[PDB]
Write a structure and sequence with these properties.
Number of helices: 2
Strand order of the largest sheet: 1-2
Largest sheet: 2 strands, antiparallel
PDB class: antiviral protein
Number of strands: 8
Shape: elongated
Structural class: mainly beta
Name: Cas7a
Organism: Pyrococcus furiosus DSM 3638
Entry title: elongated Cascade complex from type I-A CRISPR-Cas system
Keywords: elongated Cascade complex, cascade, type I-A, genome editing, antiviral protein
Length: 112
RNA sequence: AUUGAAAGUUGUAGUAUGCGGUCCUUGCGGCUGAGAGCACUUCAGGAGUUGCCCGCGCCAGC
């Protein structure tokens, strides 16, 4: 009632339990098996290098002994046609997990 | 709603700043498209042909 993120994405309270599962679930993101079959070889993974140049007070630069921040790192970039799948059980938003229905007047009305 | 319930391996980072593919170099020197050659030799603008035939300078004039 007082929180919205805890309602939709669940939460956990080790003090007294009160576990509520997430109402929205998602799967991994894989390239489709058709793409994998049709490429067979090829890397489709590129290691691109990026630098961080740090000019000194006038114009100077150092590698690892002047205390400056000048490095040369690398990052992996991928491609391909990926597959996604999500399931949103939004029908339970605002209804307590333990009491899906109230059933007080002999009708199974939702316990909102 | 199950070894279960919530859970970014994440946020900042120029593989940069300067550098003439440049300077010298004749596709040049010598070379007759030249020498011999009748557009010549034989040819009538020629033969025949009337500038013809008839014709009052005329009659009256002191």
């Amino acid at each position: 009632k007082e929180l919205a993120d805890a309602d939709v994405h669940g939460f956990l309270a080790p003090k007294t339990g009160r576990r509520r599962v997430s109402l929205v679930k998602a799967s991994f993101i894989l390239p489709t098996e058709d793409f994998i079959k049709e490429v067979e070889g090829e890397r489709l993974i590129t290691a691109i290098k990026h630098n961080r140049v740090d000019v000194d007070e006038k114009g100077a630069i150092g590698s690892s002994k002047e205390g400056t921040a000048q490095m040369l790192f690398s990052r992996e970039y991928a491609t391909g046609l990926y597959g996604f799948s999500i399931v949103l059980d939004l029908g339970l938003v605002g209804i307590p997990q333990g009491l899906p229905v109230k059933f007080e007047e002999n009708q199974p009305r939702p316990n909102i």
